[PDB]
């Protein structure tokens, strides 16, 4: 899909925080909260160069 | 509070009747997966929204 991996809203926390600066999911009282959102490295997330049609 | 409304007393009543465990005869069914009731609620921890 072209929307896969991007259906979330996630912005990096930034420097400080002792975290790896990848975007992270916003707030929430759930498992998927500040968990790493985009990028091929992250769980969930988008694959590298999504295959097109 | 104790000065409820009707729409709210009725919504709390529904939230009272949804708060009971699965009948034990219901996971001897055939096409069954529900081990227990996971949608339960405790008045102390989770606060019903509202």
């Amino acid at each position: 899909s072209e929307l896969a991996g991007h259906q979330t809203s996630a912005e990096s926390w930034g420097t400080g925080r002792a975290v790896a600066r990848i975007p992270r999911v916003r707030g929430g009282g759930t498992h998927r909260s500040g968990q790493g959102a985009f990028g091929n490295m992250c769980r969930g997330g988008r694959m590298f160069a999504p295959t097109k049609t | 509070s104790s000065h409820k409304t009707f729409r709210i007393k009725r919504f709390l009543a529904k939230k009272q009747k949804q708060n009971r465990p699965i009948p034990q005869w219901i996971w001897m069914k055939t096409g069954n997966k529900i081990r227990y009731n996971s949608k339960r609620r405790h008045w102390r921890r989770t606060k019903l929204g509202l």
Binding site: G16, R17, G34 | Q24, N37, R45, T46
Partner: peptide, 27 residues
Amino acid sequence: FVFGPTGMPGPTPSGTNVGSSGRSPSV
């Protein structure tokens, strides 16, 4: 007739608190 167990949920805690009280000013 095999009886059953139980289960209770709870909100998932998220670690985001940062006091940042410490200050090291050295100009």
